[PDB]
From a paper:
Immunoglobulin M (IgM) is the most ancient of the five isotypes of immunoglobulin (Ig) molecules and serves as the first line of defence against pathogens. Natural immunoglobulin M (IgM) assembles into monomers (composed of two heavy and two light chains), pentamers and hexamers. An IgM pentamer is over 900 kDa, consisting of ten heavy (μ) chains, each of which has a C-terminal tailpiece which holds them together, ten light (λ or κ) chains and a joining (J) chain, a 15 kDa polypeptide ﻿with no homology to other proteins, which sterically interrupts the addition of a sixth heavy crystal fragment (Fcμ) unit. Pentameric IgM is secreted into serum, or transported across epithelial cells by the polymeric immunoglobulin receptor (pIgR).
Here, we use cryo-EM to image the structure of the human full-length IgM pentamer, revealing antigen binding domains flexibly attached to the asymmetric and rigid core formed by the Cμ4 and Cμ3 constant regions and the J-chain. While the Cμ4-Cμ3 core structures look almost identical among the five classes, they are distinguishable by different orientations of F(ab’)2 in subunit 1. Supplementary Movie 1 (front view) and Supplementary Movie 2 (side view) display the flexibility as continuous movements, where F(ab’)2 pivots at the Cμ2/Cμ3 interface along both parallel and normal directions to the Cμ4-Cμ3 core. No translational movement or rotation about the two-fold symmetry axis of F(ab’)2 is present. The range of in-plane angle α is between −20∘ to −45∘ (same as measured for either Fab and Fab’), and the range of out-of-plane angle β is from −10∘ to 0∘ for Fab-1, and −40∘ to −55∘ for Fab’−1. The relative angle between the two Fab arms is a constant about 50∘, and superimposing the five F(ab’)2 structures shows that they share an identical conformation and indicate a rigid F(ab’)2 structure in subunit 1 of the IgM molecule. Within the IgM pentamer, the unique rigidity of F(ab’)2 in subunit 1 is correlated to the interaction between J-chain and Cμ3-1 A domain. In contrast to the highly flexible Cμ2 domains which are symmetrically associated with the two adjacent Cμ3 domains in subunits 2-5, Cμ2-1 is docked and leaning towards Cμ3-1 A, positioning the short α-helix (S308-N314) of Cμ2 near the tip of Cμ3-1 A (T429-P436) which may contribute to the stabilisation of Cμ2-1, though higher resolution data are required to identify detailed side chain interactions.
Numbering used by the authors:
A (entry chain G): 345 to 568
B (entry chain R): 345 to 444, 447 to 576
C (entry chain K): 345 to 446, 449 to 576
Amino acid sequence: IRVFAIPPSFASIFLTKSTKLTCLVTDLTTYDSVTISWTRQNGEAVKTHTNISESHPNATFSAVGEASICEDDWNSGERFTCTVTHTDLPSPLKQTISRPKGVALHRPDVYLLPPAREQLNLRESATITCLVTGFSPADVFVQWMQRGQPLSPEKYVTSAPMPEPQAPGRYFAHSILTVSEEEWNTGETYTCVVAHEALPNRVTERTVDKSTGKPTLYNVSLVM
Amino acid sequence: IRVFAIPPSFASIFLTKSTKLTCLVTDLTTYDSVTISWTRQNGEAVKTHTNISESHPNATFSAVGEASICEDDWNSGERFTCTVTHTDLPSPLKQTISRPVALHRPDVYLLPPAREQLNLRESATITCLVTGFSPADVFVQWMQRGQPLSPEKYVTSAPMPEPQAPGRYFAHSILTVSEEEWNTGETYTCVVAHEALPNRVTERTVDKSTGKPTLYNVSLVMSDTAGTCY
Amino acid sequence: IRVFAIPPSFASIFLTKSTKLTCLVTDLTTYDSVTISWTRQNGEAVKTHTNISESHPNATFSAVGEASICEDDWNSGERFTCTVTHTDLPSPLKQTISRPKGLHRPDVYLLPPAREQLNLRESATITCLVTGFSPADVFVQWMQRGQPLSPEKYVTSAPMPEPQAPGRYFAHSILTVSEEEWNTGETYTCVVAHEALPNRVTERTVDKSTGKPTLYNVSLVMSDTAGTCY
Ligand SMILES: *[C@@H]1O[C@H](CO)[C@@H](O)[C@H](O)[C@H]1NC(C)=O
Ligand SMILES: *[C@@H]1O[C@H](CO)[C@@H](O)[C@H](O)[C@H]1NC(C)=O
Ligand SMILES: *[C@@H]1O[C@H](CO)[C@@H](O)[C@H](O)[C@H]1NC(C)=O
């Protein structure tokens, strides 16, 4: 008799440029032929839903209802409801879900930290992280692109959001990039883009090179 | 009715300098005569539980318990079971917790702040990158010339598993400090204690003198009439 | 008729992480049918020992016995008594050994090698100086990269009180390294252990050029019109 719903975060909408509504109903009795539907605040009908998940091997039934709409409807303020109806249910339960509004809105600050000098001494690998702090809300999406070509999602893992101790309403995140030491010698800019709902373009990247953190080495002056 | 028993994490052992295991009962009604105890592999005298809770906001009753054991009798494979004889359950509830993997020495690296970060002259962040270690639950803290900092100042991160390495983990630890408190000192040695090192505890420190790789310059002067004494 | 006893040194509880008490039985006649064991002031069960020593050819009784205990029992205040009964001396000989019941943090000052040693192009000596710590009997070890070196590579000097401060001590520990291995760019950190630091473990690392950037100011003059000055 447990009902849950995962709201569509900004990190998932930015992937396919389209929001998706999902509902997770677990801790129920294993039975088939379960009707899952979505109802709006005004009762307007929703689009066709399919791709219903099966039951878990541990005697747990899970039903997922997919519904794709535009970002304007989700940002307008309309509230949805994951209605679950079945024979064993004495009454059709309801659960509302929407986008919480009324929080802070600060533009993210990207600080691409250069790799440490001692890391390159081993000549084994090199982990370049992208420090992003001072943003609201949390759960932002970051990735890496190789001269415009995105890399595989497996290489980079987004750190879990966590509130900043020195800030009342800001968060921070990390995104490492494990690459070989010999690779970061002929370019490898590794632009760190950030997805947030405060920037005018919602995307901000930084361009670096091998001689980024190293200051000038020559100061030769000519006197004539 | 579920009973949990959180094993003593390595982070709490080093900080408190004393091991302490907790085994409490949950999902129980508001009944009295609820006693708890500790049973070892063979069964001997244990420490009496103290600091009993009162109640919970969700209309339930619980009783936590702590004991005092040694550190050598934990990594040898010994098990500790907290047997609770509930009044409403004819069968006593027993929870056995113990410890068993590969061991890799952690790698400690300190990342200096970026050049563009100091241009704002608002705050400075120092990250001590720790990667390639096993198992998880590693405690990372910061100090200042031998004086430890308050736990509210520095906050560690979660032990996210390394994607490239199938059996390693990486952690992060930020330290937001003022911009003016960086060019006059504040080494902020990154002290980290792990259970896969010959010396257990290791620490590394960085400062502003780590850079400037012999920034030399040669004055090229020719066909000039200065009339001075070099 | 005197039974010696070796107190648990701080240098022995860190290298092996196992504090064990041992009382040396000497100055007695060599005979069989003897009872050697350990007793505690509390009055609980005490583990026995093994590895009985041989017989001294100079007609001197010798016996060694060690038992494995925990680490918090010695620091709590519990006393351990080693009583040995001999046929010639029926009177028991009680040997109560306990740490004194009553402190400054050590300072690691890694002295860089001089230039005269490198001029001979034979070897290089790196010493680690630690001053201002109490009490004595500390442990100094050397580690390379991520593993310790051989025990014979470095020898730790005996503790000696500071002639200036009556409540401070100092220790010395040198290390032999070739010139080629010194200019490679290694660390050769000095990690010690003390019973007063918040983490009890500290280490300091250096490099070939870690003190100052050592910038240059050389000027190249190729003008034949600018005269010189005496
Ligand atoms: C060389 O650099 C130093 C420090 O950067 C500076 O003081 C000196 O004036 C420079 N030499 C010349 C000829 O400008
Ligand atoms: C080198 O610099 C020092 C101080 O910067 C100065 O005293 C000295 O005269 C300089 N050498 C020459 C040859 O001018
Ligand atoms: C030494 O550095 C000073 C700047 O501090 C500069 O004025 C002088 O010309 C330098 N001496 C040389 C280049 O011989």
